[PDB]
Amino acid sequence: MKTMIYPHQYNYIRSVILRLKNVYKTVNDKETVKVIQSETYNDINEIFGHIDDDIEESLKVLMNIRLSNKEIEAILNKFLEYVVPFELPSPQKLQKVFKKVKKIKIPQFEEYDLKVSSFVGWNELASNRKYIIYYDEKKQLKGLYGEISNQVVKGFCTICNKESNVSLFMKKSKTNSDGQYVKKGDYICRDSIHCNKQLTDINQFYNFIDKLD
């Protein structure tokens, strides 16, 4: 009867560990550590309406100050049971979306990365464009492409809304009958993989798409 389909929740679980794991190293106090522990514990707890014995046991391990990376690995691997990874679209499905893009091919990603990524966006340094493919709420494959600046600066991307090496994703609207359109570029993290692991909320990414057109 165990069934859940929310990649964002799984990503969020591993993301809240940052305010805690970092505190286990940067914070030279014990009270602040306990405060963050309470947050992290409640954060994951609020997700699982019905926590099981193992989930509770795993949460108990997270409460330990000596939370090694191996302990986390075991816990994360156990949480994967309540979720599902991403899927790589076949050439026929890809060409079905990118009908105007001939000779297009998705790079071979890693299995681990495909378990923590909700959207695949690779950059092509041929014409300076990034191709982003994902799945919407209707379980349909949707993909788009936009120009990228030949420079890597630091900024706040609209997607994960964090701080990392970013760039620009320029996209134009659908050209009307007159041949007119509107241009709209936004800041995007160059490495979509590193950005995927920073996806606090999928709605943040969905909002970005809502701003692209």
Partner 1 sequence: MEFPEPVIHLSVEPKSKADQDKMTQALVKLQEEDPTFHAHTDEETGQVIIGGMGELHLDILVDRMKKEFNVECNVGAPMVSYRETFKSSAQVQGKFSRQSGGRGQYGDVHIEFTPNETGAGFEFENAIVGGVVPREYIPSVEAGLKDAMENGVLAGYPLIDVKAKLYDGSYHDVDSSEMAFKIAASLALKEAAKKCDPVILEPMMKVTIEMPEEYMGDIMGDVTSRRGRVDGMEPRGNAQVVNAYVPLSEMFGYATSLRSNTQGRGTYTMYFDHYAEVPKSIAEDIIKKNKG
Binding residues for Zn(2+), by number, are 157, 160, 189, 195
> Tokens 């990603």 identify what position?
109
Q: Is 160 in the site for Zn ion (CB under 5 A)?
A: yes
Contact stretch for partner 1 (CB under 8 A) within 46-54, 104-112, 133-141, 204-212:
204-212
In order of 55, 125, 202, the CA distances from 160 in angstroms are 27, 23, 8
Q: Is 13 in the site for Zn ion (CB under 5 A)?
A: no
Q: How many residues sit close enough to partner 1 to count as binding (CB under 8 A)?
A: 40
Minimal distance, residue 156 CB to partner 1, in Å: 4
Q: Which residues are annotated as a binding site?
A: 157, 160, 189, 195
Task: Pull the structure tokens for residue 152.
Answer: 């890597």
- The site string for partner 1 over 28-67 (x = CB under 8 A, - otherwise) reads xx-xx-xxx-xx----------------------------
Q: Is 116 in the site for Zn ion (CB under 5 A)?
A: no
Q: Is 158 in the site for partner 1 (CB under 8 A)?
A: yes
Q: Is 157 in the site for Zn ion (CB under 5 A)?
A: yes
Residues at the interface with Zn ion (CB under 5 A): 157, 159-160, 189, 195
Interaction site with partner 1 (CB under 8 A): 19, 23, 26-29, 31-32, 34-36, 38-39, 149, 151, 153-159, 161, 163-166, 168, 170, 179-180, 182-187, 207-208, 211
